[PDB]
Amino acid sequence: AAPVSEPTVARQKLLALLGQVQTYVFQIELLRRCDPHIGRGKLPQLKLNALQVRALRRRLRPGLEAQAGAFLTPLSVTLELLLEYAWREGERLLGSLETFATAGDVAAFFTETMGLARPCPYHQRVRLDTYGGTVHMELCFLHDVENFLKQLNYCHLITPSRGATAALERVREFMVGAVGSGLIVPPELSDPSHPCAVCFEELCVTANQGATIASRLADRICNHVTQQAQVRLDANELRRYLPHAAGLSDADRARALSVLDHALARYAISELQFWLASGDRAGQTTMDAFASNLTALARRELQQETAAVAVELALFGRRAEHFDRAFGSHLAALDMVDALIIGGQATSPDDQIEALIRACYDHHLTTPLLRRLVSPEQCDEEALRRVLARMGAGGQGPETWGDIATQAAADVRERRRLYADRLTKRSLASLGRCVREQRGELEKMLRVSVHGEVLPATFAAVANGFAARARFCALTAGAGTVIDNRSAPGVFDAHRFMRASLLRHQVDPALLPSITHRFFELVNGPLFDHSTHSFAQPPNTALYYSVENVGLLPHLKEELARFIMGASGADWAVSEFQRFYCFDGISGITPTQRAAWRYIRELIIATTLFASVYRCGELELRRPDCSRPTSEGRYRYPPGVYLTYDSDCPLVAIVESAPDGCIGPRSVVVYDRDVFSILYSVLQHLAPR
Amino acid sequence: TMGGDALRVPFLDFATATPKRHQTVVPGVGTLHDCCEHSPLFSAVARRLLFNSLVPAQLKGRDFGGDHTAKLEFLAPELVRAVARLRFKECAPADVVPQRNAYYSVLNTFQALHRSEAFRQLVHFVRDFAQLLKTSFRASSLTGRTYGTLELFQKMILMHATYFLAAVLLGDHAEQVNTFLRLVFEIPLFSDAAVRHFRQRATVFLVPRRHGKTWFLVPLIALSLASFRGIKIGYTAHIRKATEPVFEEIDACLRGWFGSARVDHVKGETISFSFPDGSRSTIVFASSHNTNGIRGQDFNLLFVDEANFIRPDAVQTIMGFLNQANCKIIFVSSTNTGKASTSFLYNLRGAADELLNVVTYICDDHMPRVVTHTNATACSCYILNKPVFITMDGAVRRTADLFLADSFMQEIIGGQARETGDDRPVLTKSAGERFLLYRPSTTTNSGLMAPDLYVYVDPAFTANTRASGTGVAVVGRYRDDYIIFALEHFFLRALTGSAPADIARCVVHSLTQVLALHPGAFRGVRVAVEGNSSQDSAVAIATHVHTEMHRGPELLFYHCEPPGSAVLYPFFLLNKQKTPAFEHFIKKFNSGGVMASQEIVSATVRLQTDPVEYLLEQLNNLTSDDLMVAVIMAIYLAAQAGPPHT
Amino acid sequence: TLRDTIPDCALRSQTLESLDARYVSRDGAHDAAVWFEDMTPAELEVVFPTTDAKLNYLSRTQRLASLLTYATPDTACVHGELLARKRERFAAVINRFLDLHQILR
Ligand SMILES: [Zn+2]
Ligand SMILES: [Zn+2]
């Protein structure tokens, strides 16, 4: 049990390096906001760290290059992103610091580092470049990478290999800039309204009370491409750590505390009224409580600010001008909302939620409509008990004001009590949802959002398919006897013979489920697997996931589910002589994908009929996107007939590969476009044995 | 037996420049800065590669790489040979003394979970379930498609059972078990809310006709008995003639792939599995519905099979079980679409959340059945075994002739037709509920209102018809949103001599009330009278409104210069602007930007129904419309267009 | 043995690329250490002495910067519109969250 494999201690070493690099990126994001005169003190440290990051590549460069071309993993994707973002932002900040001490101005240093004069470097062009038509999209947001990777996953049987792994290098160039930090997400590129690919499985797996998923997916925050990090911050954090500092070995650690105590003993709240206000004004209100809480928070913030200023003055001698001070003038002229979203470097973004909840929830609210929030499970349990118990057993039209005003006053007197009794007697299940939804939509906006683990996982899951396909395309070219049949000097005869000998039999309608399954298994993409899990699911579900995420028109799901439901020679053979996977006379995205579904159906039904007629062959219809690599550099492609989805040389028949799995000198393989010639070449081999 | 190689790694004491006041210890790796814990991109990779060792090899998948889960832990040989000659620093002695202790101690709580039999019970349960479903549930010994598949609900039920049994038998490890069951169900990236959802009790399932309903619960029980120790799964049902089949199908396999000595069986009553060390777990059958089930000790499951028509006088024991502190009444059911609404249970969706789940193949609207089409299983797709005798028809016309409720059934005729014809809802239920419930009080927040009122009247000039109602809306801007102040759905008295004045008197009365409720708020009221029905009659209404209002706010009418005319008439013609108006409304309404005043005025809709509730019923027809049209158009006018005048 | 880069350089009056070509890009460079220096300034730890406190500030200033850049004449950026829409929706949501709990009393 003592010998541990090298790809296990190497993973631990890489995790340690990833932790160090994440720490370094944190320090970088910190120095982009400190006063330049203090940053210049850490100029040798920053230069040495940038040197270390530079020297960290040029060693992991060939390793990660040979990895990106063979089965990326969510480790070496985040590692690439972070080792690129460090090598970028470290040198950028170092340049911005060495530009300082020449001009000697701070307000123009926080416009270089913090990027206040850039042309918004959060745009990209993808140009998917499928067959028939090269659709192009732009990656502006974070969900716009999910919605492009899912599109490239769904349109994988239609997209060339080297035309996709060259549009993924254009996605990584954006991710390095957006999700490259891995620690904080700018509010620009984060739209929590758009659901992700893993919060669609949530609704599919959690409980739905009717309310089909197409309508449940529109009330979601998706909470996965960005998280909340639950930052908490004590009250007297400055006084706690003051008697314990890094240096300060002198008694100055006591005079600093003295000046802190002396200075301690030494939000635009006037804007709430212009918001909508209901009910009685005289007396306590929700607005009054919110104003008092925000005043307390502002007082704590001001006290912390003045104590920090006094401590920095007494300790080092110079009052530093960090980002929040050099641009502090813009923190004054701030509206209630623009200063409620941002703000609170002394308090925490959870303290604002606390100040709001303490305002909306007092002892006078109600007996009901208060317990359902503190326990949304006992409410549904009581509802289940109740359900089980119930199921067990004229004229004189006035013109002046005195009458129309009185009748309107009576009508509003009735109706103001009507809905007031609605919100209390009935409508508890609706209010218990509305409030628990608005509270979530608030906490997602106020809490510090960091980053989610979705993008560097789906990116790897998508890129691995195309990597494996391009790897199988080139690993078989170097093999034993190759029988490449893309040149047809004498193949028409053997193609037409086999096509006639196979079109003579019916599809055996007792086999239509075993064909629909192998159709939904080929058509599906590599991202949404859901069919090779330990707790597998039918391929139609693994396809429903991959086709519902990328919003597909409902008028095309019947064309997919009911494609092989009907199976004579019509709708059976679509390929011409050598144009099996050729999309020359088709443009678009959906009519270019129907032509791929047709070729896949033809291949499947031809293989079934060949197994039925010539019983000698087995014809395991496989796909190269499977067969993930073992411990090292071994792929063990078993025999069969691979589709390969490549319009250059689609069908690759591996008739006799090896007794161990790899492709070497005893691995006769047959390249061909057409399917029937492939079947004839397979017959000419497997039969005399 | 020892698991994987990820829980046995050596120290790797690289280095650290951070003070101990900050550094944290991630298990499996050394001691890193604290900022590596608020970054999920690292604390979700360094933690998944650990629990990917506890997961046995029979649960990684079917094609995952020979030796490891390649999709998580794989490094190319070049990268391994490159990081091999990478050497970190060496920790200082005074710092390596406590660092190694912290590292090897934060890892002990994992090499301690890999030993506890309480967790080995769960691991054995899941691994045996997987390996025994590999070959579909049959009489195997436990020693081209060849691998069985769990459908969606057959997996949701397994999750509801397994997460609860883990949270009950393992309480001291409620953190190392969640992020292991995540890996074992291939369900990572799943927020703790949507996984804690499985920790709740009494989650009802409504299943179609067969869908392997019974075929799945017997292996579930057989494996949840012979794996865990100390649970008594109650299994009620309908009339007990159906429970003995469950007896036989449980005990045949439970004695099949196990030893008969541990199979304790009494006819018509409890079944018990015994373990080689003084342990026994049973499946005591509460199907008797009389006794032996009232006193609950360790039930925790209460697998109620068919709650469609509840068993007579058997709800008392169920309600008593609901009082048990650790019971999760699974409440399986079967609505075979023969009724399509087990309203004894389906009424639960009214006031409850995350309680019941329906496995349906047709939505509420029976037209978008294609919504759940690719999800319907392929095994249940059999037809007459002949497409057509002699016919060349496309799949559309074929499915029209071969509809038969799209599932060979005889589903309810009427309502939503058979040809879908692109029919869908438009306003979300969630926005609708908020429209009903959150109503700003305008009389006390008048500072938030714009100083202009907009009114639209959509007249109908007939009586004694259901579509003869005149719609009136008066709306305004509230912050940057739109708020409704008044609504009318007005019905002419038959054979009046003054229909336009009757309509005018109705709108004037509405306006007046709105004006009186918000005195001095409005500088202008702008009035549009739809003239599509009758231009002359629309003009007459405007004239009466004009005159009556003459008894402050200025009154303006929208004017229209009909084609070929130079005259400006005080009516509004609804044509090209309808689609933009509706489109904008739908977007605004759905995002929470249209609301009703808490003191909304309505003389015509007051005694029978709430005016906002009534409007919403009309609005939910978007895919008699006088009110909906007036509201949508009044708002469009308050939005932006050409100027209306005096 | 296996010395670090900080005992190697010892001189900090140069540009980064010269040091790269002289110490990490030479063929004879042994390159047998990985140690990231501590870059946080003590003048910043003494005021934000907590990783949570150093992250709340690092997020507040990030939000401020993302507000300032989006508040010659292109102005046609989707991020400015996204920030505007988010701010408007947040204001409108807090609006109907204080009043709703005022009514419930
Ligand atoms: Zn932009
Ligand atoms: Zn999500």
Author numbering:
A (entry chain B): 2 to 267, 306 to 432, 478 to 651, 654 to 775
B (entry chain A): 35 to 177, 195 to 602, 614 to 685, 705 to 727
C (entry chain C): 12 to 82, 96 to 129
Excerpt from the publication:
By using the block-reconstruction method, we were able to improve the resolution for the structures of the hexameric and dodecameric terminases to 3.5 Å and 3.6 Å, respectively, suggesting that the complex is intrinsically flexible with unrestrained symmetry. The backbone of the polypeptide, as well as most side chains, were clearly defined, allowing an atomic model of the terminase complex to be built de novo. The 85-kDa pUL28 (which has no sequence or predicted structural similarities with bacteriophage TerS) and 15-kDa pUL33 remain enigmatic for their structures and functions. pUL28 folds into six distinct domains: spool (residues 1–119), fix (residues 120–191 and 533–563), strut (residues 192–226), reinforce (residues 227–413 and 510–532), regulator (residues 414–509) and packing (residues 564–775) based on its roles in initializing the assembly of the terminase complex, and all domains are engaged in extensive associations with pUL15 (interaction area ~6,700 Å2). pUL33, consisting primarily of five helices, threads through a compact “triangle” formed by the spool, fix, strut and reinforce domains of pUL28, thus firmLy stabilized by extensive interactions with pUL28 (contact area ~4,500 Å2). In turn, the pUL28 N-terminal spool domain is twined around by two N-lasso domains of pUL15 and pUL33, further facilitating the assembly of the complex. Unexpectedly, our structure reveals an intermolecular Zn finger formed by residues C121 and H124 from pUL28 fix domain, and residues C101 and H103 from pUL33, which are highly conserved across the herpesvirus family. Furthermore, the pUL28 fix domain, comprising a three-helix-bundle plus an antiparallel two-stranded β-sheet, appears to fix the orientation of the pUL33 C-domain. Two clusters of three-helix bundles formed by the strut domains of pUL15 and pUL28 support each other, along with a second intramolecular Zn finger (residues C197, C200, C223 and H225 from pUL28), immobilizing the “backbone” of the ATPase domain.
